[PDB]
Amino acid sequence: ADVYFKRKSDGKLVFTAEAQTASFSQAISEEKLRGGIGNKPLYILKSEKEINLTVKNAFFDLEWLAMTEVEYRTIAYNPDTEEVYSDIYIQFPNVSPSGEFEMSLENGNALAPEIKFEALADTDTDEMAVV
Amino acid sequence: ADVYFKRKSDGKLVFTAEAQTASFSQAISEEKLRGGIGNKPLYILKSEKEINLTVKNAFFDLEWLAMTEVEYRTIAYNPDTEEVYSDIYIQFPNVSPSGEFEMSLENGNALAPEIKFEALADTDTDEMAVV
Amino acid sequence: DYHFEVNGTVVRHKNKGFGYMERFFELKESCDERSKLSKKQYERFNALFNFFEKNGVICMAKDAGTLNTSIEINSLAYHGKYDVMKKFIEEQSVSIEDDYKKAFFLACLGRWEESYDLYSNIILNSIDESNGCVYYLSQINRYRIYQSITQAVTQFNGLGLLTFGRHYKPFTDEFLARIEREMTNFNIDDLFNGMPFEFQKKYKILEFLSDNQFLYDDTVKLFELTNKVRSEMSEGSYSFGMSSDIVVLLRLYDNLRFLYENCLWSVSFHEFHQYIRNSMSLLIEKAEYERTRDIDELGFSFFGKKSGFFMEYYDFVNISRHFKIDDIKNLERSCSIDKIRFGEQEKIEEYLVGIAEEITKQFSANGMNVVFYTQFISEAKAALYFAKYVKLSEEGLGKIVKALLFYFPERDLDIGKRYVWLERLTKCNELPKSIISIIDDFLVLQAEKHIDQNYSEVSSNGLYSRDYGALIKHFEKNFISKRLSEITLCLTQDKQKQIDFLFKLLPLLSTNAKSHLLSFKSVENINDLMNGIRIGLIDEFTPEHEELIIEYLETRKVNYIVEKEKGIQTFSSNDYMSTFGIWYFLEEINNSKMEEFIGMDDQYDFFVDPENFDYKKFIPSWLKNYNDKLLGKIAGNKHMKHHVIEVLKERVKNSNDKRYLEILMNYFI
Amino acid sequence: NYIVEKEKGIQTFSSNDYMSTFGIWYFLEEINNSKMEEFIGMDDQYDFFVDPENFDYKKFIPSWLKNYNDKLLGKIAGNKHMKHHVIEVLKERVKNSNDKRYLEILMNYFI
Amino acid sequence: EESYDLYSNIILNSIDESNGCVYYLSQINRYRIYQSITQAVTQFNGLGLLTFGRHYKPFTDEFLARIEREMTNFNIDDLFNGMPFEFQKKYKILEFLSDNQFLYDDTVKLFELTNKVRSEMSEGSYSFGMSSDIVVLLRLYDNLRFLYENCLWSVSFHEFHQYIRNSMSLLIEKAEYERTRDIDELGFSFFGKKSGFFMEYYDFVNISRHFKIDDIKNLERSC
């Protein structure tokens, strides 16, 4: 389990770590404010998928530190020792850099903390790509 | 909710305390064993029901402590009568103590521990009689 | 400088200088580099290798690889080998450390006063040899065993007289005087500070044990991890990489090992019991959740396979030791432990039968160690209650069943309590004949206890020897108990209580014994009626019997009228009126006089007049007590189905109880 | 793309919300084209609605129902062939899963 | 930087009047604000520019150099012992403030109460008299008041946020279960006012300050 964080359209590596929490929260049809209810012309509204994902220990690129929107990929061949086939490159291209301060200070620094981040969307829904 | 642990033999209170928890267990383990399941010629409807009551600060009257099957009897009164008030005296004619050793001692203090006793039933289910 | 994770890996934390710890692991794989050191230096490296591998220290975090590891507890005390301790006390003295193990075994065995004396002898002999570590630990352990005896007599002084039926004084008043004198003005907080400094700088890792609230850093971390895990469970997040559930699992084992090893008496402390109880109960909760988890389209493939967590022998001991019977029930009602695989079952059965023989010796030969009994009955009960989830052999079950129905004191396990546990054992494996023989001997023993002729079967659950016969008849359709059969000739209207015993033990009696009973002893009051139905003696509402029910029903109104004038409302939980109503609900009994009775019991009015019954007073908990066929065929009728439907629809979203959900799924479709 | 994905030997299941609504359109009969029925394999939901009779219910995901509104669930309710399959999967995952949405779905239907 | 410099003046001018507590609290507060600055510069110079995108430098490099000068090799556990003996026996109430892990005894009781509360609500137990779900509310109010009074900077730390977040979430969950409960023949509402718990002003700000969108979302989906 590893994360390669790159700047989209720039290709520069941001940091490497290991993902610990992966969330794939599904859409909920409870709001009732979806619209087009009484008329019901056509069922078009699909899932408003929400996905959150974090990392363990970020190691930022030294070259990227010099000059002081972003893609991301992973590697996983652990199940059934299928390393030659069944490759899964979890590709969210427009992951949003997020995260909170969370001043704990009662354990000291733990290298890099758990960086919050989620995948955004664009004109065409490209939230997640297995390849 | 001040309880008075009475004695079945004579009536002298064993101790008095205030109620902490009164758990009326709502659970029946369905196992096709009770009743007349061999032939089923009628109905029984006698599922076991469990009642427990725990206190937090006993009294331990000295006269009973002199001599070094048991009951209890209590009242429940709230000054805010509001619109409904009643002289509810919950009492089980046969209750047996079931307090464990419960030695914690990490804080260094125990004071009056939580005395937990379990109600019983003899011949007909005369327990849980509010009278 | 370096942070040692609980998994086994290490990571630089404040090592701003050379990576010596990484260098040590750098030489771990390089054979030739180790030989390049001096002979003594190479010898030290070998010793550190033995220490690190025993302590579970693994290589650098970069070379993670497989990190799943099962810890082991070599301490005999944790395994409850009470027989081994008995001979371990009388092995004289080889070394102070060997005496330290003896003292810890002495405390666990229950001989606390002897254990306290042993701890007193340890500190006096620990002046030299620079062995302050055992002196340090014994000083704390002497304080803990001093604390334990103080509450023990306090429990005997208070809450002890009624529980045991009398007062017990395992410690002489002089001993209680002696222990407090030696413990005067002793504050344990500064023990690490108030003790020579060469220890203070070398054994710094032991500073966390001096304070009385030493069980705080782990519990706080467990509490934070519990919150972190519960957040994942609600949100359904997939724990990639190292997962907190594995972390807490490893942390408790390290805490369990570090305390049972090195002979720390705090292992029996309730906070440690609380620490383990909350630790494993969280693990059971996530194990149940993982099995009952939605298979999402994303992240379905991860490190965890199918049924990633397995119940092992060590977990069973912890469950059987650091849990109480009520908390186990909460675990059962929250998580179904029968679904999760129980590994190394053969390594658990000998522990269960091993705890049975200790029970057998305690309550059969002479007396029992009461101080040990209090500290052992909770573990003893928790082990037998949890035995339902493990397959057991015929020989293993026989000893446990013999222990269950022949040695447990009634003060902690009444007649009703044993049947609940008996059914658990009987449900796991089909009842063989050998177990029935032990059960049969139990019932006849109770009959012979009627010598005083004032003993009455009183049970907490309301279940009597009535249920033991039902279990026997359920598994063995035809079974006659000779011992009870022969007893009837000698009894001729002499012991009425023993006479009443036979009525509810009828299906195990012979043809001649049953003929002699009903010859002139039979049903007279309403109590024997439902007993006969459960027995099977009474099958139809004879005209005389229907008179008995309404006659008793008439009595209730006499008190009902008078209690209303003074505002009283008697609600004794006899539930007989509910039985009368359910019979009338199928018009199996057609007397109209009892239909006149109304406003007596809320359940009773439900059955007699279904349509016009005031459903606002209906209680859904009564539905848990009802049969299958009546609920199943009532669907579609809609005369009274619709009224209860409103309650049924409410319970699925209001309550998380699975029993309510099952009722609305199997029926009312 | 689907056929060429086997050139590299790896299959693709992209969580993009195009194929999902196409089967719903065919289920609602808002499209009446026979060409689109030939497309099988791209999305599990797509095969669930385009060809429900031969759809492999082992790949069914209960979360799909939470996305469907009352009408779509009402329309798929009582089809004499989905009704049998949808009831079985719902009964299994109303006890295992304690989400309140699953409870509501089972209660609005099969009364 | 101004707060650090100002806190230097409080301790510097507290030499006289034998205040003790004001000097002691400001000294602890000085370490707390310095602790916040340590990861403040760590989350700006470090972490690159991820949440923001432009390198903000709120504190000068000279300021970073000096603050470490005096703050090098500082241990807060001995600060209370480092205080004068007269203060030690006179202000012993503040003895646990020196500990970095002071948010442990309070959390342990809450964690102990949470297990008791969770077990109580699973079995349908009724908390007669001193209800175990009210003491936790009383405990957090004192912790919130005492921390916010006397002007302590520790209230902004993540560990304190965890204490309130876990304690307040349990109260919401318990209050949800209380109203959404089965009725028992013996467990009637003799004098209980149904839910009983009501969201006061002080309850809302606790949820609006210590919770997070990730944390609050699971609360909604559960209660």
Residue numbers in the entry:
A (entry chain B), B (entry chain C): 9 to 76, 172 to 234
C (entry chain D): 337 to 1005
D (entry chain A): 895 to 1005
E (entry chain A): 449 to 671
From the paper:
Defense-associated sirtuin 2 (DSR2) systems are widely distributed across prokaryotic genomes, providing robust protection against phage infection. DSR2 recognizes phage tail tube proteins and induces abortive infection by depleting intracellular NAD+, a process that is counteracted by another phage-encoded protein, DSR Anti Defense 1 (DSAD1). Each DSR2 protomer consists of a conserved N-terminal Sirtuin (SIR2) domain, a C-terminal domain (CTD) and a middle domain (MD). DSR2 assembles into an elongated tetramer, with four NADase catalytic modules clustered in the center and the regulatory-sensing modules distributed at four distal corners.
To avoid the cytotoxicity of DSR2 NADase activation, we co-expressed a catalytic mutant DSR2H171A lacking NADase activity with Tube protein, and successfully purified the DSR2H171A-Tube complex. To gain a better understanding of how DSR2 recognizes the phage tail tube protein, we reconstituted the Tube-bound complex DSR2H171A-Tube and determined its cryo-EM structure at a resolution of 3.58 Å. The structure of the DSR2H171A-Tube complex shows the same “bone-shaped” architecture as the apo DSR2 tetramer and reveals a 4:4 assembly with a tetrameric core of DSR2 subunits braced on each corner by a Tube protein. When the hexameric Tube is superimposed on the structure of the DSR2-Tube complex, a clash between the Tube hexamer and DSR2 is observed, explaining why only the monomeric Tube protein and not the hexameric Tube is able to activate the NADase activity of DSR2. Each Tube protein binds to two DSR2 proteins on the same side (3152.65 Å2 for DSR2(a) and 886.14 Å2 for DSR2(b), respectively). In the Tube-DSR2 surface, the phage tube protein forms intermolecular interactions with both the middle domain and the C-terminal domain of DSR2. The Tube-DSR2 interactions are mainly mediated by a large hydrophobic area on the middle domain. On another binding site (Site2), the loop (aa 35-55) of Tube is completely inserted into the ring of the C-terminal circular solenoid structure DSR2, forming strong hydrophobic interactions. For each DSR2 protomer, binding of Tube proteins induces significant changes in the conformation and relative positions of the SIR2 and CTD domains, with an RMSD of 4.1 Å over 984 aligned Cα atoms. Upon interaction with the Tube protein, the circular solenoid lid of the CTD in DSR2 undergoes a downward rotation of approximately 30°, firmly attaching to the Tube.
